[PDB]
Ligand binder design. Structure first.
Ligand SMILES: [Mg+2]
Length: 266
């Protein structure tokens, strides 16, 4: 009895080439709509970057970006929660002083920011997760309103740095969540994809019993635990599989659309 379908993007809905079966999807979408089944894109990426994947139908979908702080539906802003400048400045000072190896990117309403001096190769890596990317000589004072920050770090120091963040004075406001191999999103504490879906379920008057959800990452775990019909991609790591009730094929075998066509076929 599925009424909302929510999917992660990178590593899940998207294949390893960063694309998906457009035709198969649009035909599925027509089906979902005529059944009043809601479709939710739930990603750490900014909304502006998520809509580009759905050029011809984005206005018919709901988007959860920034892991949760920004929600758009029907091409309209439903929720936008910004971090406090004082908190941002403070966690930045802490990371610069304590973990100089982490590359810091700020994710703003309209663009992203890196510090000048970051290597071209990093700039080239990140520039994909941002509409526009501006380089500044300092973060103090700050530039725009910001949904989240992103740290690029060695995957092996990831846990340590996340714990350092959780133990810092900004603790009640800011928390890290693994948003990919070698990445930590510093989000407003509690504003994760599970929270986002709860807000949408509560607003559409459904329960988690009607939720089907797909993920492959740490930042998908609250969402997966929430959804009764929770799917870890075949390519997800053990801990993310632990949070799911069902396993899908890999993102390179259209694992998401496969499950959806299966449900519909039911
Ligand atoms: Mg992912």
């Amino acid at each position: 009895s599925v009424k909302v379908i929510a999917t992660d993007m990178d590593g899940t809905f998207l294949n390893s080439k960063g694309s998906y079966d457009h035709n198969r999807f649009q035909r599925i979408l027509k089906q979902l709509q005529e059944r009043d089944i809601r479709f939710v894109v739930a990603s750490s990426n900014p909304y502006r970057q998520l809509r580009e994947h759905f050029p011809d139908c984005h206005e018919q979908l709901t988007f959860v970006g920034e892991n949760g702080a920004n929600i758009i539906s029907k091409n309209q802003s439903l929720i936008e929660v910004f971090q406090q400048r004082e908190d941002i400045a403070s966690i930045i000072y802490f990371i610069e002083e304590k973990y100089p190896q982490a590359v810091i990117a700020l994710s703003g309403e309209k663009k992203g920011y890196l510090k000048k001096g970051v290597s071209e190769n990093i700039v080239k890596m990140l520039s994909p997760f941002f509409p526009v990317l501006e380089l500044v000589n300092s973060f103090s004072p700050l530039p725009e309103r910001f949904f989240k920050l992103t740290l690029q770090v060695k995957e092996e120091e990831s846990a340590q740095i996340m714990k350092a963040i959780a133990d810092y004075k900004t603790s009640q406001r800011l928390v890290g969540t693994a948003s990919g191999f070698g990445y930590i999103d510093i989000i407003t504490k509690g504003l994760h994809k599970g929270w986002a879906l709860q807000q949408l379920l509560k607003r559409w008057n459904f329960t988690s019993d009607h939720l089907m959800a797909f993920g492959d990452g740490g930042n998908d775990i609250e969402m997966l635990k929430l959804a009764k019909y929770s799917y870890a991609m075949a390519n997800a790591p053990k801990n993310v599989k632990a949070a799911a009730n069902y396993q899908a094929k890999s993102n390179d075998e259209s694992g998401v659309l496969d499950v959806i066509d299966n449900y519909l076929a039911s």
